[PDB]
C-alpha cells in the first residue's frame, strides 16, 4: 500500500525526521515535504515522488530504490548505498555528498557538481561525465572506470582503490593527492 | 593454542562491555524528548558477529538502532510539539534492557572462567621441563 | 571440527532489524552447562597428560644411569 498522512505521523521524531525502516510502503505522495532527515532504507519503494523535498538527508541504504525524479530538493546528503539506482537524474539540488557505492548505476549527469564526497565504489559505471566537479574526496575503488574525461575537478583526494587509470584529464587541478 | 583462548575470551570481554555501555545509554535516554544532533534518540543494539577468519573470536560489527516506532505522546503546549500536538519519545523498552543487563553480566563472568582455566593449563605446561 | 546438530534457539523479537517475517531471531545452539563440563574435562585431562609426559622423562633419565 501507500503512506498516508496519519501513517506519516507515526514515523516522525520530535525534530521532524521520517523513519521508514523495514516498513511496507511502496509509494509516497507527490509534493512530499520532510522537516528533517528521511530514511527509506530496506524499503520496497522503487520510485521517489515528484516534487519531493527533504529538509535533512536522504537515507536509502540497502533499499529497493531505483528511480529519483528531477526537481527533488535535499538539504543534507544523499546515501543510496546498496540500492537499485541505475542512473542519476539531472537537476538534483544536493546540499551534501552523494554515496552510490554498490549500486547498478551506469550513467551520471553531465557536469555534475557534488558539494561533498562522491562514491562510485564497485559500480558498473564505464566513464565519468565531462566537466565533473567534486568538492570532497573521490572514491572509484573496485569500479569499472578506467578512463577519465578531458576535464574534471576534484578539490580533495582521489582514490583509485585498485582500478587502473590510463587516460588522465588534460586540465586537472587537485587540492589533495592521488592514491591507488 | 591455549594463548588463542585469551584472544578469543578477551574479545568476548570487550564484546559484552560494548553491549553493557549500549544498554546504559538506553536506560539513560528512555525519557529524553530532546537530543543534540537533531535526532530523537532511538534504542540502540550491539549486534555481535563471529569473525571466523577452531578459534572463532567474536566482534562487534556496529551498533544498530531499534526498528520499533517512537512512542508518541500528546503534549500540545510543549515547544517541541508538532501541529497535531504530539511529542515523540525514544522506543527504549525497559524490560529488554534489564534482560540484556543480566545476560551481558552473566556472559562476561563466564568468559573469565575460561581465561582462568586456560591460564592453569599453561602454567602446568611450563612446570614440564623443570 | 564438526558443528552440533541441535536445532537453533529461536527467539521472538520483532524489533531486531535482522529478524524475519514472524519476528524471530535464531540464535546459536550453545548450551552453557555442556560448555562448563567440557571446560572442566578438557583442563583436567590436559594436565593429566602433563604428569604422564613429565614422569616419562624421569624413566628415560633413570635408564641412562643403568650400570652406574
Amino acid at each position: 500500500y501507500e503512506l498516508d498522512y496519519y501513517s506519516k505521523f507515526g514515523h516522525t521524531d520530535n525534530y521532524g525526521n521520517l523513519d521508514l525502516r523495514n516498513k511496507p510502503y511502496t509509494q509516497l505522495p507527490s509534493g512530499f515535504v520532510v522537516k528533517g532527515n528521511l530514511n527509506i532504507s530496506q524499503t520496497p519503494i522503487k520510485k521517489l515522488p515528484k516534487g519531493l523535498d527533504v529538509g535533512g538527508s536522504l537515507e536509502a541504504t540497502n533499499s529497493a530504490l531505483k528511480t529519483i525524479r528531477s526537481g527533488t530538493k535535499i538539504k543534507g546528503y544523499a546515501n543510496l548505498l546498496g540500492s537499485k539506482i541505475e542512473s542519476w537524474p539531472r537537476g538534483i539540488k544536493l546540499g551534501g555528498y552523494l554515496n552510490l557505492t554498490d549500486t547498478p548505476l551506469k550513467t551520471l549527469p553531465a557536469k555534475l557538481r557534488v558539494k561533498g564526497d562522491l562514491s562510485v565504489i564497485r559500480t558498473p559505471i564505464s566513464a565519468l561525465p565531462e566537466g565533473l566537479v567534486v568538492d570532497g574526496n573521490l572514491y572509484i575503488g573496485g569500479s569499472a572506470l578506467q578512463v577519465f574525461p578531458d576535464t574534471m575537478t576534484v578539490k580533495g583526494n582521489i582514490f583509485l582503490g585498485g582500478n587502473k587509470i590510463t587516460k588522465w584529464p588534460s586540465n586537472l587541478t587537485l587540492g589533495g593527492a592521488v592514491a591507488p | 593454542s591455549l594463548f588463542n583462548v585469551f584472544n578469543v575470551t578477551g574479545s568476548a570481554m570487550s564484546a559484552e562491555s560494548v553491549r553493557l555501555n549500549t544498554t546504559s545509554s538506553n536506560l539513560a535516554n528512555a525519557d529524553s524528548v530532546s537530543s543534540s544532533a537533531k535526532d530523537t534518540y532511538k534504542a540502540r543494539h550491539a549486534v555481535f558477529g563471529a569473525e571466523l577468519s577452531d578459534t572463532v573470536p567474536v566482534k562487534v560489527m556496529g551498533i544498530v538502532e531499534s526498528d520499533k516506532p517512537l512512542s508518541a505522546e500528546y503534549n500540545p503546549d510543549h515547544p517541541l510539539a508538532n501541529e497535531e500536538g504530539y511529542i515523540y519519545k525514544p522506543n527504549v523498552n525497559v524490560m529488554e534492557e534489564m534482560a540484556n543487563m543480566i545476560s551481558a553480566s552473566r556472559a562476561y563472568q563466564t568468559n573469565v572462567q575460561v581465561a582462568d582455566s586456560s591460564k592453569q593449563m599453561l602454567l602446568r605446561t611450563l612446570q614440564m621441563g623443570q | 571440527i564438526v558443528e552440533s546438530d541441535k536445532p537453533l534457539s529461536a527467539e521472538y523479537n520483532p524489533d531486531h532489524p535482522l529478524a524475519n517475517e514472524e519476528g524471530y531471531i535464531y540464535k546459536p545452539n550453545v548450551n552453557v552447562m555442556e560448555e562448563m563440563a567440557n571446560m572442566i574435562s578438557a583442563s583436567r585431562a590436559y594436565q593429566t597428560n602433563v604428569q604422564v609426559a613429565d614422569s616419562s622423562k624421569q624413566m628415560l633419565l633413570r635408564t641412562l644411569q643403568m650400570g652406574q
Binding site: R21, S41, Q42, S57, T61, N62, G76, Y77, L81, G82, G95, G96, Y97, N99, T101, D102, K115, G116, D117, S119, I121, R122, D135, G136, N137, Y139 | A37, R44, V47, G49, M61, G62, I63, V64, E65 | P17, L18
Partner: peptide, 24 residues
C-alpha cells in the same frame, strides 16, 4: 560485509562520507 544499518560515531558533517562504519 555484515549488518546493513550500523551507525557512525563521527559527528554529522553532511559533506564527508563516514569511513568509521564498514561502508561497503
Amino acid at each position: 560485509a555484515g549488518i546493513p544499518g550500523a551507525l557512525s560515531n563521527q559527528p554529522p558533517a553532511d559533506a564527508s562520507i563516514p569511513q568509521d562504519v564498514a561502508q561497503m
